[PDB]
Design a protein around this ligand. Structure first.
Ligand SMILES: CCCCCCCCCCCC(=O)CC=O
Lengths: 373, 371
């Protein structure tokens, strides 16, 4: 099995209260004379249950946005800076030399060819023969997805150590994509009311997603750092719900990027969540009521409610999902790593207690990881 | 260890002779009255030593490019179609059901969130719990890179079978990106003389890169298909040359392909440390290798590998023949070459082969094979 040894996070300098971000979007609507009810901005910025968010990229780009390449360059540079900080903090706290890392796995939606993990090799003295696992196309689920893929690798390499990091810059959407699309949709709205749901989805995207980075150090069973107090990855499983590609994803469009998040995600989630988790738990002779801890990615407050209702959970079991959403918002693939970092600073989990990491993302795909302390 | 069982390829319907592609680019320069030597286009389209290329995206609309939104959707759809065809041929020729594949690995620069491998489970009846390995950020190295990562997974799963596919749509750059960049670059050439080298690199990009897909079926040692005589993946290794990020890659701006002239010289810093170290740790020398399978980044790349290892002029002929047949199809190229080896050539028993590819980073990948 694989041992999760330590975690770290990194955030940009500028933390904005959710009230400030809502007012920023309201002002953009108002200065632009867009015929749309401003109360819907407040409604969805309130209903997402987020108190504030880190933005790596400027907020003033709302009114006058820079060029595509400039924003792309800034997102790439900020992603590298956060990833380097998270990895350096992780290595320092574990007293692990970079040359003793065998695999560096990455998940990020920031366009990077070569990948972020390759570029970091020029900032941190990894050995030039470092193995890399640059993953993409997984979106919000990438944090849990990466843990599973690294655990599968360390199954065959019990002596090795691996680092996984997840970094996302959701503020790139505020650099011109959200502005151009909301303007076009609202101005074309009078001629066809079918665009109303499209405007709402873009407002929800502006309300929900934030910037951040998390990292995790994972080692094989025979590594010196594999100690009995640590969570062990004992199994993992993926699930993809058929014919749900259009429900969630990130599309490249004329206006830049467009985040896709349809309201039918919550009901498609039910089609995959219980078959995924029930099968994983049963195949390990575990019942869900005996799980000591849940670590569920907060795609939204509705997603948390759906997971709670589907498994009949007491409403403080997923409190970490709600607290994380309030503190940092939805930071996409990095969120579950941030949450895992919070757990590892809680008191020592009772021995032999079982935990579950659950994430959902484009696909529509779900990832489940069974942990044991 | 890990066995390579079979391979397949998939290409779009339109095969364009290189002279036709060169003529199309000249027509763009001529119509737009771009002040630049038209014979620079002819020499670079000729000197890449490519006879023709497959373009999945249209060439008719070169002078009137469609929107970038519909180009991405077309590239996404063409990528899905080529991958589905290659995987289906692979499954049919091996008589393997989709539900019996444990892992589907993908490498592609085509923007896809969710990834291509996820979207393919709605076209091919894979199990809903299929494990996926969507990789990106590796460019032309992807095919060799994917083989190594699947091999490492199958080291922990000796009973399982995995599919890797690589697909790239290089013709996406002909849907507006090369047109916009070359126009602006040529206009500023009188004002900025140093922009000549930038025009050359875009012309080389237009001459070099093509579309295609390749797929490979790999199994662990305990799988029923793991029979003697098939190539074994006995080891693999990666190498990234320090401080060479700007030499190769793909930038968002549409796109711009980055391929600096210093690429071939920078390869010398990584090739021999990578390959000789890998072979020494497996108790063989490069002279023991019976077959080289080297990604043809270009005629200069092939020559550099030849000189670094003191190879005969025909040892890397497969790289040159592939370049002539289909051009540089990026991550898919080495899979196409491996397909030629497994399907058309005799590999002596217990002989050694080496897959070598290089891509953005600058990175190189080596995979040691044994029959
Ligand atoms: C350079 C960064 C480009 C912008 C990244 C977008 C970050 C927001 C997360 C939602 C995107 C998505 O749909 C996939 C997740 O499920």
């Amino acid at each position: 099995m694989t041992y999760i040894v330590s975690t770290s996070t990194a955030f940009p300098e500028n933390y904005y209260p959710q009230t400030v971000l809502a007012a920023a979007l309201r002002r953009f609507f108002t200065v632009m004379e867009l015929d749309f009810d401003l109360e819907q901005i407040d409604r969805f910025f309130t209903n997402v249950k987020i108190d504030g968010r880190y933005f790596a990229l400027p907020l003033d780009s709302l009114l006058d946005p820079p060029t595509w390449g400039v924003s792309i360059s800034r997102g790439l540079e900020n992603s590298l800076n956060l990833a380097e900080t998270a990895i350096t903090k992780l290595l320092e706290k574990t007293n692990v030399q970079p040359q003793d890392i065998s695999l560096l796995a990455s998940v990020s939606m920031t366009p990077a060819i070569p990948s972020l993990d390759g570029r970091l090799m020029n900032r941190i003295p990894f050995s030039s023969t470092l193995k890399r696992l640059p993953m993409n196309g997984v979106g919000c689920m990438g944090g849990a997805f990466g843990i599973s893929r690294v655990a599968d690798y360390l199954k065959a390499h019990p002596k090795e150590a691996a680092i996984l990091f997840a970094v996302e810059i959701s503020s790139a959407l505020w650099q011109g994509s959200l502005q151009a699309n909301l303007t076009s949709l609202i101005r074309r709205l009078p001629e066809n009311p079918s665009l109303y749901s499209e405007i709402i989805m873009d407002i929800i995207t502006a309300a929900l997603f934030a910037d951040g980075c998390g990292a995790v150090l994972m080692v094989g069973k025979e590594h010196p750092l594999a100690k009995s107090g640590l969570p062990q990855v004992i199994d993992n499983r993926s699930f993809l719900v058929p014919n749900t590609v259009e429900l969630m994803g990130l599309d490249v469009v004329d206006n830049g990027f467009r985040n896709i998040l349809r309201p039918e995600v919550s009901d498609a989630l039910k089609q995959g969540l219980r078959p995924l988790i029930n099968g994983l738990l049963a195949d390990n002779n575990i019942e869900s009521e005996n799980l000591y801890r849940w670590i569920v990615h907060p795609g939204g407050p509705k997603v948390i409610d759906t997971v709670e209702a589907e498994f009949g959970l007491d409403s403080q079991t997923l409190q970490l999902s709600r607290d994380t959403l309030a503190e940092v918002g939805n930071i996409s693939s990095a969120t579950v790593l941030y949450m895992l970092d919070k757990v590892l600073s809680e008191e020592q989990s009772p021995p032999d207690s079982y935990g579950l990491i659950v994430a959902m993302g484009p696909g529509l795909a779900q990832e489940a990881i069974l942990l044991k302390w």
